[PDB]
Amino acid sequence: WELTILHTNDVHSRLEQTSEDSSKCVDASRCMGGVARLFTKVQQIRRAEPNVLLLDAGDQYQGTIWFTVYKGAEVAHFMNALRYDAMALGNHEFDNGVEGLIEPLLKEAKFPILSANIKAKGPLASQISGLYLPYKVLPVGDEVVGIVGYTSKETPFLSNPGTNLVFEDEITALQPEVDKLKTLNVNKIIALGHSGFEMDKLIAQKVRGVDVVVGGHSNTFLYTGNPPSKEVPAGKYPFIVTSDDGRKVPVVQAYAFGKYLGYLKIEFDERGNVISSHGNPILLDSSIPEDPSIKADINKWRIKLDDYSTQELGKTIVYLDGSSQSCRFRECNMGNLICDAMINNNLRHTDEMFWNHVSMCILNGGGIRSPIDERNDGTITWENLAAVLPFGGTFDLVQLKGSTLKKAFEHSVHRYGQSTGEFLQVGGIHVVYDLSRKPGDRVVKLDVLCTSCRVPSYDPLKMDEVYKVILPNFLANGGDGFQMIKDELLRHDSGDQDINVVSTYISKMKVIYPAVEGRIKFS
Amino acid sequence: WELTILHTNDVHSRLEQTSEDSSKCVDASRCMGGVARLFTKVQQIRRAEPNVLLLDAGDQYQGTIWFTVYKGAEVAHFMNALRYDAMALGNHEFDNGVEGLIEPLLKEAKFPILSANIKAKGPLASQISGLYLPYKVLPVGDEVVGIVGYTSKETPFLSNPGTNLVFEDEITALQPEVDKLKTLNVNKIIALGHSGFEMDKLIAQKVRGVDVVVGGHSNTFLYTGNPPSKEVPAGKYPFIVTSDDGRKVPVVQAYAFGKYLGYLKIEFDERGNVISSHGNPILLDSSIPEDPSIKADINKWRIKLDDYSTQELGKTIVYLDGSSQSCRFRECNMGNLICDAMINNNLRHTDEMFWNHVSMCILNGGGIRSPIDERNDGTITWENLAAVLPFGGTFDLVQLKGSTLKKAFEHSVHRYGQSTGEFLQVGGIHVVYDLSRKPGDRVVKLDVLCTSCRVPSYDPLKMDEVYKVILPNFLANGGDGFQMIKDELLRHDSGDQDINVVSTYISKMKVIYPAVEGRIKFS
């Protein structure tokens, strides 16, 4: 019996086709992804293969102005149009709190939404009961397939789920659900979830009864053969894990941003044992036409986005200096604004040991692409912010040792004076450079804002201590020569869209007035 | 023909009786003012004197939780109960914008509200037309008296009137209105307004046809004889000005906070010439009973205030360190919070030459009377803020030369180490002390945030430059040994209530997290 699993993960609001690097589509003849093109390919496969499941491993929420305006209604609408068979909750599905998940996604999706390791307490337990499920048994041809969900146990640090949801250890929660499915004579089981490739391999190894793991969160690209685009594979597709009971369990993921459609064919025997599996993610490039009906519906929904983009978000009473002459040479108030917005975006519920789990921000000055003039009655619109932050990136959370952060600050000024992009704007850090010193030894003072403290204050950076830092995905990936960040980081989780982080902060503040205040000094 | 003018000014929300220093009444047997006691005295005078006018010279708005909750409805209600005959607009009547004045005061007052020097433009001109008047002619016995209003031309820097109101020069605007009254055979004219004692003397001198000036704003106490309480008179009551045409024009004011009722008897001849005048403000002490009906109505309205005082205003995720061990010895995050709230409260409409007219704050650490613990789910209520700021003061705007501010910072640490109240918390200032230096020479660096700049940044304090600073009225009055502030200041305007400034800022922010960030350093 052959099952074809089609899968997406970390689509992150890429409803429209994007450029090759998942930013705004500018050269239509070379654009990729989008739900209209995904619809064409899914429909084609469903005409040819008898047993198909289309699954999403979470993180449809967050990524573009579509999510900013429609707040998940676009996810329910377009996932319903594609006829997804099941979806697991991702961390970003909690960005607008549990209410922003219940309404509109859980109440409007025409497919089960799953997570076996999220437990509710208090009145929320009654409000949400049955709106998401630990698993669903689906009929596929003349057989049934059980799909069990899971979501990152770290979601409380990576989104806004509130204090009435408990995120349990994935393996601990999954095992009893898989054993329950076995008692109900369900012999084909898919674990679909959102914890990252490392956890997916552990689930494949340790959760007895799981036949295949379909994952997400880490934006992992897996491929068997020569890669079709710029993404470098982390391993073969599927990635085979040997389970504790000796079975070979395929693990799949399909990068992010709707650029690829995962495709895995699994051959099962009559007892649900996996005989073999093969496949590869399909690059959704311009060789696949965008479905005209879906494309026309996307164009209709785009009107409200164009209208929103010109509305006032808030006001500034100061000139927002995002010039290269300032932001690539010294502390600039646009850099302070964006770092303050990044820290505000990352305020999460913590225990009594931290005021907040993260207090620090770094931002390459070359990533700030325009100033914003305050003389248009102080108005700031999304279009203005898009000129400052045009790359379509995210502001991510990483864990870096102090030694790595000291190397990053040395890199920030290693060739100072040429208007190069690596000069860092900061938040929660006070740095002093002495440019008369040799490159690599110019950082003379580096103080950081504490997190494990009830009163935030600055203390010297410690080389062996691991710090949480918010920074662009461009830097987390080693952009601008920050290879030490990519190579030495101890954890990396994708954050919210860059423009959205700043837009939300400006709207909350109503009137902003960022100052240059001594975060970066020269001796 | 004898006219008795009863007058109040700068009542500033003191609806209830207060202590002798106009703070919360604690020893009822020695409390003063309040509208219930004012009603008793006004009613008594109106039984005895045939020709009485009860006038208010503005600034009923702002000062206590009454204004915070009722937003001017309490002013219309209780001024109507007292049967005020006329009121001039004060600067604080614009604290909640022109909408917060129109509704509820202008639409609900049963007496004319006046100002001849405020002109509206755009659609507001039609919306507000006739809701306030340049003057009113009132019948008094068998005669008529014209009352012409005026309001501080500096109101755009001292409140939130918006950009659709123009505040003209008082004398320029008043003169044509007084000459118009003379054409209508009104020969007895009172100028009632809110610009301060200095401007009141200029109006008495230069506006031809004005028989008496009844003022406010500067909280001026005038008295003829031995003063009845702790207020020190600035001059006799009335203060006589010789007009340009040789007449003697009495000028009156009655301190502030409803502690006194101004009382002036004027003898006019048949042609409206002033023959003589005499009087004195009446101290509203415990020898005058509170009117039982007004007192019962005040007690009924107080219920909503008690309810509000326990509601959540916002949350803190950090411990708000308002301890004396911190705030009298070093930078404390409660001090940073309050100074940031003071600066946010003073954001006003400026020309293209300033991002804001004021950027600096000083606050005596001894004025911070409690910390606020963040472990009650982060909740902050008005009752918590009242424990931090219990004195019932205001956060005022002053103009100080840099030399005066350097002397204030030397005074801040002149006897450092004894937990004395004069140690300053700051905003928009970065100070460095070297305590090994002799007292009076411990300030080694003092940088201030620019105002006449599009990008706020810090520059060294200049001894000859005049800076605007927000600080408690306690310090503006030379409290805590800051005699140099009282003696050397170049301008002083009373600001908003201390608790209200902080409460509004916390509600706007929703979640606060003030840090200790290096505003005060020790070498």
Ligand SMILES: Cn1c(=O)n([C@@H]2O[C@H](COP(=O)(O)CP(=O)(O)O)[C@@H](O)[C@H]2O)cc/c1=N\OCc1ccc(Cl)cc1
């Ligand atoms: C995020 N990012 C970035 O910050 N930068 C910053 O620009 C700087 C280069 O700018 P430049 O010196 O002004 C000359 P340009 O490359 O703009 O021609 C870099 O140093 C770096 O700081 C560059 C690339 C970049 N991402 O590359 C992917 C990408 C490119 C274009 C678009 Cl529209 C969307 C995604």
Ligand SMILES: Cn1c(=O)n([C@@H]2O[C@H](COP(=O)(O)CP(=O)(O)O)[C@@H](O)[C@H]2O)cc/c1=N\OCc1ccc(Cl)cc1
């Ligand atoms: C505003 N203010 C103030 O900050 N202080 C600060 O307290 C300090 C004295 O406090 P302490 O060392 O704790 C001994 P205490 O006088 O509380 O017994 C002063 O140095 C100064 O910084 C003092 C008086 C004061 N205003 O005096 C008028 C007033 C007094 C009491 C009440 Cl409830 C209402 C209005």
Ligand SMILES: [Ca+2]
């Ligand atoms: Ca099986």
Ligand SMILES: [Ca+2]
């Ligand atoms: Ca006259």
Ligand SMILES: [Zn+2]
């Ligand atoms: Zn994701």
Ligand SMILES: [Zn+2]
């Ligand atoms: Zn994720």
Ligand SMILES: [Zn+2]
């Ligand atoms: Zn006043």
Ligand SMILES: [Zn+2]
């Ligand atoms: Zn005033």
